[PDB]
């Protein structure tokens, strides 16, 4: 699981030192951004019902043909399994933005994501869709600190990269 | 390899939560108590052969069959080993003073380490014995309290710190018993 | 520890460390600095001699080598041959084991599977027989597995574990037995050492083992050897066998239980304190109400064949005696 | 963890759990649950379907058989209506969960305790 | 098999000193900790069967999986196992409350359950749900103010919060 | 008693493979029908008794 | 599994034997009689709704106070109501299942074995589902021999319960 | 280790049983005479040197044969009188383990084990270490309770030598 | 039985050595934990009467369908609240032998054992008896250490039948 600590600590252990003052650096990096990013934590936690209604809400309001057949939901339990697939990239963007790396939502949630979006038939447009409608959403400033907005627009982004 | 914060977050994912307060508000003194951390690694860190060989030193000292002819360490060559071997498990404890978690420590060098020194025909107790000195000197040099170094930093309590070093070095030397 | 914790089985497994790996991504030649070859070269000691120790003055040993690979003079596939080849190895590896062993130990340093079947071990023994100790090295690395999953810029890594290559199930679990995680070197665990061959019966017959994951108590089994029977005279003694016939699976499904450390002080018979036999210290179990010399448990490490229906009361028993249990499997 | 144990945080209350800890199933009553505490609001759905406090209790229930107010009776102004959105768009979203409508109304967040257990 | 005083007395044994004034002192302390170390242990002892049975209610509502066909508790001979799992489970964390070492509870019961709940096909997590419910209801049950004289008991409840988050830690 | 007849062929070839214990084989042995008949049928289960506290306990 | 072909072959393998005359005339009167319990298996199978239904009110007429009582192991809840009818469907299904197979495998297999540390567990009562199954036995309307393989399983699955 | 602790645990364990009330009574008799206990294995570990030293001394006034005996095992070499005062040295830290735990385990764990294979395997007769601790018990100087407790495992110890 | 006092005996014969320190400190833990122990016996013993009396007014009060039910094993004939307040003064007077004894032993061997085979044989559900021991151990109305001694006999003979 990637973080600041976990790269510079497995760094070092695999070149076989003990933790110099660059590892120390970066740790101290961590304790800097650190402020921002459990303050988006806190809002993530906060408001994540009315995020993920609204992110499954505007990713039928753009693809209406997913209830068209059979191909993504047409029926009250396929779109149960959506809702509660954002509600784990929502709690993996939570856990990575705790973290601080990319590491939680890299082994959860992408790594060897595109057999399973590719066998069961599921598009990854439609899963852009709900990301980018909540990338939209928040508001600079208006809720969450100017910071902590990059920070969550950053990870946000890097799900949406990761996934097509 | 899982700090304080993948601890946390592997324990709301089994409960399969969001973070919480409760466990952001421990977080937060966690980074609020995060340079007395780094201040602390970095006493350990720079005082690392020095606490090797005084720890090593004092185990063949206290019991000085090791070195009668048929000990393990009766060879220069056993020596160095057994010197490089303290070297690596002071090496492993910094890392687990860094993260904060044991995990790196558990999953990387305690893992395996009784069974290779039975296997080696190491005798135990001389290990955790070198182990409990390099706990006294560690906590020795984390407190400031050496006889033969005392640095100027900033006045604090640190109480919790030393009592989570303890911890990690009660863990290798009761792992390798 | 586990499987459950951190979605990922397999860094509990005890290959947590054998994730990282190593490439030269630097062409041409490197001037003045020395940091990153340096790290690729700990890499390959680290794995040819799989994280056996090396000191100062045997660095001279192979330093030719050394000063080749920084150069434009070997790849990494023809130094790693290199450090192969070289009194080292030969001292630690070949010279101290018969050959299949030496042979197991050349695929966990070289390829990082196991051998998964007798024919692998027919191939490199015919090599070697034919040609010698160099023809033996070469037919490891001068064949299309190493140059294939290797592709001559990478130092070799553990893929016996992994699903991609086809291997055996038996291969896994073989693989197991040869990598105990990071401490264990070479001749660190029991099975290796310098006189065993390891896995013979195992490795030879295809028999998939069973996996203790390091630590977590019984992380030592090392379980009893059996013989052959009457034609290839045998002590029936010593382990419970692998198979479990007819006759007793009625009461549930049979369960094979490997129990760990098996010691005097440890078994107390369920109540604490060791058991006094005389008023003063006679210790050992009475025979027939006189005194004998013969301990409790006569080896460590005993097994149970163990139906269902059975499981509770001997999952009791082990732990009145104070045994660690290393594995339960199916039969 | 050496996160928690090194900075605790304070245990809340315990008189819900205590409730349940205390007496048997039949001692007690309605509290019985007790230790049921909130999932998410996927895990009220249909593949998994999850249970409520609301559901244990007697409360939930509540049909009356033989049964019939008028509401032709009441005086002429004390019939009154409400409904709780009026608006087509946002009653039923596009997919198919709902606050309203449906049997998708059963998987609201909140609500997955109950307040009953005080009798 | 140690409590408190078989781990000091063997940890000074290892070394080969004796005890120290400062160890006996700390002795002398966790003696006179050891009422409300008896009185919490009486509570467990009581409450018990309603602790496990309200804890698999509250178990199985949550998870409506496994009381269903095919699931692993079901039948009635493995609902009868279930139940009978978490007795033992917190039969053994009465006992490491009552020793003030977490030995007997790894020594007889953790150490090796994983084993057979990987060798039964049988969910861990979900035992790990049991477990925290038992230690919410415990630890709740712990801190009741009925009966027993009143005094401060921070201490105690953390540890024993300590033993139950071992074993949970032990299944998963 | 001991005879070709009462004989058990298979407890045997299991004991041998190390497949049971001395334990099981007696108490398999014990089960028999061969037994049933020559020792338990004959028998006033208080009798019975005797011989199982005996035969297995000395 | 408990069938009378496994209690024949699993008595010849412990004798380690082979399945002479006796066992061959067991198999053989359980060919007989399979008929009867079949055709009665298949009228079980073909009311079964009736009767798990008519069986919980029979209950509910009986103890009364059981939808009145509130508490989680009464039917006064539900899900209550849902557990009511879902144990009765477990009982009449181990019926059908013990019809078929012609001994009373399934039911001590899935059903009997340790079904008391369940009621005592949950507080369940002997009574009530003794209750349903009086009613099952007297509303099953089966005639003849197959009334009496029903009549048999049934009273069976009471005698366990008291 | 066999403390009250541990034979209440394990009794109770080994009926699979709770820990009602006996053992938790037990456990309370072991939390109040503990305090007397205590007292004593501080004054033990006040004058050990001299219980020690003292211990030999009389040892040696009693045989005096010992010293002037030529052999491997007499105390006649300088190495035979430090495994003098070692060995006594053992049998008083014995007696002060077994003051701290309150009951006789770690006496009948690290020394009453097979004590008498090395009495006869080294040739060393009981009768001297049984005046070695007939000094220890009279010289220790303790008062009232805690001299009853120093007195029951030093007494203890000589009913197992002899 | 089982006493304190008859658990150390039967352990330290059953290991064949004497009764040393653990026993005897477990003996005196028993003779501590004695008096508030007979306080509570000689109360409960005093107020008996009426502790029967509103135990079974509770039952009534809970289980209102009982002295309606007719039948033999319901309370509605003279004979069954002759039963009901024999069985209640059963009860009670066992937690008082268990008082007095100290441990378990009396509940254990005369009422515990074969329990089941009875509520189950005469339909005697074990719920209709946990509401009799929680109105005693409502109104037993003993105050401190005492009612925390009648509270665990009594809470252990409801986990019993639970
Ligand atoms: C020191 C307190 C010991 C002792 C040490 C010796 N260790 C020897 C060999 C050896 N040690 C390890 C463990 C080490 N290697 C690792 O990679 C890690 C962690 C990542 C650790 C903790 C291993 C795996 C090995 C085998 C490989 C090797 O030889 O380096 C050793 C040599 C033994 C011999 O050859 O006879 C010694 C002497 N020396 C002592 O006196 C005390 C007991
Ligand atoms: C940890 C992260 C994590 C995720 C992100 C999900 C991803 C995921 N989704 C599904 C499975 C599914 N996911 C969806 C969702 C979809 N319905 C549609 O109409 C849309 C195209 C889309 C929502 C935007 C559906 C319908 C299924 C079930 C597919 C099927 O069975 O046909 C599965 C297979 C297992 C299952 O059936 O649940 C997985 C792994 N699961 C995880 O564990
Ligand atoms: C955890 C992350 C998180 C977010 C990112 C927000 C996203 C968000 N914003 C709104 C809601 C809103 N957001 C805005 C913001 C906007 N005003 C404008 O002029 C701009 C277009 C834009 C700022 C750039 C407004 C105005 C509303 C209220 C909209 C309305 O009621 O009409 C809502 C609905 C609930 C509410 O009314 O608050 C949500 C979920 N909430 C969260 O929980
Ligand atoms: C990159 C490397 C790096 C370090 C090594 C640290 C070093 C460091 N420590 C402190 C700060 C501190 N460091 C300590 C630590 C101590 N407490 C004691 O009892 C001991 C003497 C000692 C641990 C052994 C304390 C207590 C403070 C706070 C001092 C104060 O505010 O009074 C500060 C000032 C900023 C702060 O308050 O955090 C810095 C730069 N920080 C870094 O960025
Ligand atoms: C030649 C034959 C052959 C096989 C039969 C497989 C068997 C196999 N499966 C896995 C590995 C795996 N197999 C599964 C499959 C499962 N997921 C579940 O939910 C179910 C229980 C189960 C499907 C029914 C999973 C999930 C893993 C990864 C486990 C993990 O990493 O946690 C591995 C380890 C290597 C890997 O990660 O791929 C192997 C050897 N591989 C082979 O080479
Ligand atoms: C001394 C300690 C000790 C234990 C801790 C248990 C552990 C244990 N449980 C089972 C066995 C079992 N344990 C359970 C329990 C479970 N049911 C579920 O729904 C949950 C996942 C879980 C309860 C939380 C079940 C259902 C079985 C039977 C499994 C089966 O036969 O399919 C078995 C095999 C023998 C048997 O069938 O009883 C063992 C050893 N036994 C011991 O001797
Ligand atoms: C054999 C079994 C056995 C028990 C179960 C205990 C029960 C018990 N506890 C206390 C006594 C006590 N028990 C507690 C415990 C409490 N502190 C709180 O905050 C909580 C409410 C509670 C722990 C959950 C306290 C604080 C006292 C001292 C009360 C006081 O002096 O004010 C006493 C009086 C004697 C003493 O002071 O120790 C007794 C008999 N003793 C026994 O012999
Ligand atoms: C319940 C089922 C069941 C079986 C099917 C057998 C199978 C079986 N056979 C043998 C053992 C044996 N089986 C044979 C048989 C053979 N001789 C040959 O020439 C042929 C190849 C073959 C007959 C066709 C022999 C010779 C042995 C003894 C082998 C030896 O000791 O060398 C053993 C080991 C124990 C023993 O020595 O008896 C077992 C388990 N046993 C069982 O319990
Ligand atoms: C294989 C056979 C088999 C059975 C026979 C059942 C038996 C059974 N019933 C319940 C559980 C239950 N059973 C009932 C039934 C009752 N409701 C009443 O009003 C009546 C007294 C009675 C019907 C006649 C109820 C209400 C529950 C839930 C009790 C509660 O949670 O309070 C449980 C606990 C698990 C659960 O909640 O489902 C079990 C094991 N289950 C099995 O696996
Ligand atoms: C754990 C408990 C424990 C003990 C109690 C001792 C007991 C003991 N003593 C000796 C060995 C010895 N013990 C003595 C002691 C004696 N010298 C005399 O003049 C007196 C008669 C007597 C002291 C009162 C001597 C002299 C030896 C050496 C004997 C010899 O080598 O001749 C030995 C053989 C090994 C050795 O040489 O050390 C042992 C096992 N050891 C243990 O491990
Ligand atoms: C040593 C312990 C011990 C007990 C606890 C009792 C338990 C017990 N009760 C009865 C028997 C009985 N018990 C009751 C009691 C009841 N009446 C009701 O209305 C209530 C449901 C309930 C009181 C709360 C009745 C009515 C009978 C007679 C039942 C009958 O004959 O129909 C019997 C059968 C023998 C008899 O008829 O007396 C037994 C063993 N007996 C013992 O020896
Ligand atoms: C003659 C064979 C021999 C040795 C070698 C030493 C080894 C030794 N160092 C100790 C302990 C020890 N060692 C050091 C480290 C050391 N001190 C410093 O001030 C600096 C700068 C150091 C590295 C250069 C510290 C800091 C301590 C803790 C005691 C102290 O405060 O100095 C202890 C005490 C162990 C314990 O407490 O259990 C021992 C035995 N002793 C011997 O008998």
Same mark, same amino acid.
């Given at each position: ?164 | ?177 | ?331 | ?119 | ?172 | ?58 | ?111 009997? *074995?340790? &079904? +008391?540390? @369940?009621?005592?567990?949950?507080? =369940? !009562?002997?009574?009530?589902?003794? *209750?349903? &199954? +009086?009613? @099952?036995?007297?509303?099953?309307? =089966? !005639? ?19």
């Amino acid at each position: 699981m990637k973080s600041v600590i976990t790269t510079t600590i497995s760094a070092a252990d695999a070149a076989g030192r003990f933790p110099s003052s660059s590892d120390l650096e970066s740790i101290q990096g961590n304790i800097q951004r650190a402020s921002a990013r459990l303050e988006a934590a806190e809002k993530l936690s906060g408001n994540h019902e009315a995020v993920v209604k609204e992110a499954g809400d505007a990713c039928f309001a753009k693809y209406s043909y997913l209830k068209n057949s059979g191909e993504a939901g047409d029926s009250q339990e396929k779109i149960n399994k959506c809702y509660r697939d954002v509600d784990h990239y929502m709690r993996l963007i939570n856990y990575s933005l705790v973290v601080g790396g990319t590491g939680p939502l890299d082994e959860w949630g992408i790594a060897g994501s595109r057999e399973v979006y590719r066998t069961l038939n599921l598009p990854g447009s439609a899963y852009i869709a709900s990301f980018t409608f909540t990338r939209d959403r928040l508001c600079v400033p208006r809720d969450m600190s100017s910071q902590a907005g990059v920070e969550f627009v950053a990870a946000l982004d890097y799900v949406i990269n990761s996934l097509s | 390899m899982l700090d304080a914060f993948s601890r946390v977050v592997v324990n709301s994912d089994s409960k399969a939560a969001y973070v919480g307060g409760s466990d952001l508000q421990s977080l937060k003194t966690f980074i609020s108590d995060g340079n007395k951390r780094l201040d602390a690694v970095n006493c350990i860190v720079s005082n690392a052969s020095c606490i090797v060989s005084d720890a090593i030193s004092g185990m063949i000292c206290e019991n000085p069959g090791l070195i009668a002819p048929g000990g393990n360490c009766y060879t220069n060559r056993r020596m160095a080993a057994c010197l490089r071997d303290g070297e690596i498990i002071l090496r492993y404890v910094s890392y687990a003073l860094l993260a904060g978690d044991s995990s790196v420590l558990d999953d990387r060098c305690l893992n395996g380490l009784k069974e290779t020194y039975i296997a080696l025909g190491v005798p135990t107790a001389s290990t955790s014995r070198a182990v409990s000195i390099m706990k006294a000197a560690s906590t020795a040099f984390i407190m400031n309290t050496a006889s033969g170094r005392k640095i100027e930093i900033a006045a604090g309590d640190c109480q919790a710190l030393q009592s989570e070093a303890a911890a990690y070095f009660d863990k290798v030397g009761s792992a390798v018993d | 520890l586990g499987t459950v914790l951190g979605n990922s089985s397999l860094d509990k497994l005890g290959l947590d460390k054998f994730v990282d790996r190593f490439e030269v991504n630097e062409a041409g030649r490197p001037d003045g600095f020395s940091a990153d070859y340096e790290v690729i070269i700990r890499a390959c000691y680290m794995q040819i001699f799989a994280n056996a120790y090396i000191m100062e003055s045997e660095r001279a040993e192979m330093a030719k080598a050394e000063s080749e690979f920084r150069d434009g003079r070997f790849t990494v596939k023809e130094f790693c041959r290199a450090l192969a080849k070289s009194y080292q190895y030969r001292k630690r590896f070949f010279d101290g084991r018969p050959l299949y062993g030496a042979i197991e130990l050349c695929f966990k340093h070289i390829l990082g599977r196991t051998p998964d079947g007798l024919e692998h071990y027919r191939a490199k023994s015919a090599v070697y027989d034919t040609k010698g100790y160099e023809a033996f090295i070469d037919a490891f690395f001068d064949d299309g597995e190493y140059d294939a999953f290797y592709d001559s810029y990478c130092v070799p890594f553990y893929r016996g574990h992994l699903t991609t290559s086809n291997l055996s199930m038996a291969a896994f679990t073989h693989m197991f037995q040869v990598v105990r995680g990071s401490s264990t070197s070479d001749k660190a665990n029991p099975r290796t050492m310098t006189n065993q061959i390891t896995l013979n019966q195992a490795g030879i017959q295809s028999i998939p083992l069973a996996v203790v994951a390091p630590g977590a108590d019984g992380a030592t089994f090392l379980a009893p050897d059996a013989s052959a029977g009457s034609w290839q005279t045998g002590f029936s003694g010593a382990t419970k066998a692998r198979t479990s016939h007819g006759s007793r699976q009625e009461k549930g499904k049979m369960f094979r239980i490997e129990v760990a450390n098996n010691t005097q002080y440890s078994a107390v018979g369920g109540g604490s304190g060791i058991k006094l036999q005389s008023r003063s210290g006679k210790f050992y179990k009475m025979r027939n109400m006189a005194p004998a010399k013969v301990s409790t448990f006569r080896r460590a490490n005993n097994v149970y064949l163990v139906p269902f229906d059975e499981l509770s009361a001997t999952y009791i028993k082990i732990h009145k005696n104070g045994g660690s249990i290393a594995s339960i499997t199916p039969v | 963890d050496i996160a928690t144990a090194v900075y605790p945080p304070v245990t809340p209350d315990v008189r819900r759990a205590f409730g349940a800890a205390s007496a048997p199933s039949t001692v007690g009553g309605r509290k019985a649950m007790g230790l049921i505490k909130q999932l998410p609001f996927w895990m009220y759905g249909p593949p998994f379907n999850a249970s409520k406090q609301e559901d244990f209790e007697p409360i939930s229930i509540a049909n009356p058989d033989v049964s019939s107010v008028d509401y032709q009776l009441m005086p002429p102004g004390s019939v009154i209506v409400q409904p709780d959105e009026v608006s087509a768009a946002k009653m039923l979203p596009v997919s198919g969960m709902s606050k309203h409508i449906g049997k998708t109304k059963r998987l609201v967040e909140g609500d997955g305790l109950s307040d009953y257990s005080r009798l | 098999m140690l409590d408190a005083f078989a781990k000091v007395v063997a940890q000074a044994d290892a070394r080969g000193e004796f005890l120290s004034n400062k160890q006996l002192n700390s002795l002398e302390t966790m003696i006179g900790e050891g009422n409300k170390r008896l009185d919490i242990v009486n509570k467990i002892n009581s409450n018990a069967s309603t602790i496990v049975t309200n804890s698999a209610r509250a178990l199985f509502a949550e998870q409506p999986q496994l009381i269903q066909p095919g699931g692993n508790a079901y039948t009635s001979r493995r609902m009868a196992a279930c139940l009978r799992d978490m007795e033992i489970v917190l039969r053994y964390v009465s006992y490491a409350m009552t020793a003030g070492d977490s030995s007997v509870l790894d020594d007889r019961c953790l150490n090796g359950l994983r084993e057979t709940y990987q060798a039964l096909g049988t969910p861990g997590t979900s035992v790990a749900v049991a477990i925290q419910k038992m230690k919410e209801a415990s630890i709740a049950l712990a801190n009741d103010l009925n009966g027993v004289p009143l005094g401060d008991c921070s201490s105690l409840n953390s540890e024993l919060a300590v033993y139950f988050d071992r074993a949970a830690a032990a299944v998963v | 008693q001991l005879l070709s007849s009462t004989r058990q062929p298979f407890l045997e070839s299991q004991l041998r493979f190390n497949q049971i214990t001395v334990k099981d084989f007696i108490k398999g042995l014990i089960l028999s029908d061969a037994f049933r008949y020559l020792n338990y049928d004959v028998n006033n289960n208080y009798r019975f008794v005797e011989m199982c506290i005996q035969r297995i306990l000395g | 599994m408990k069938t009378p072909i496994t209690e024949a072959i699993a008595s010849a393998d412990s004798q380690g034997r082979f399945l002479s005359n006796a066992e061959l005339q067991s198999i053989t009167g359980r060919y007989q009689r399979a008929s009867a319990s079949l055709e009665a298996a298949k009228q079980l199978t073909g009311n079964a709704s009736r009767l798990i239904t008519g069986a919980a009110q029979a209950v509910y007429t009986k103890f009364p106070f059981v939808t009145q009582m509130p508490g989680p192991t009464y039917a006064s809840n539900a899900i209550g109501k849902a557990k009511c009818a879902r144990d009765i469907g477990y009982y009449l299904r181990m019926t059908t299942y013990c019809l078929v197979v012609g001994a009373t495998g399934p039911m001590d297999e899935y059903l009997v *074995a340790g &079904l +008391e540390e @369940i009621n005592r567990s949950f507080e =369940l !009562s002997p009574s009530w589902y003794i *209750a349903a &199954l +009086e009613n @099952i036995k007297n509303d099953h309307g =089966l !005639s003849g021999q197959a009334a009496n393989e029903a009549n048999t399983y049934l009273d069976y699955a009471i005698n366990v319960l008291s």
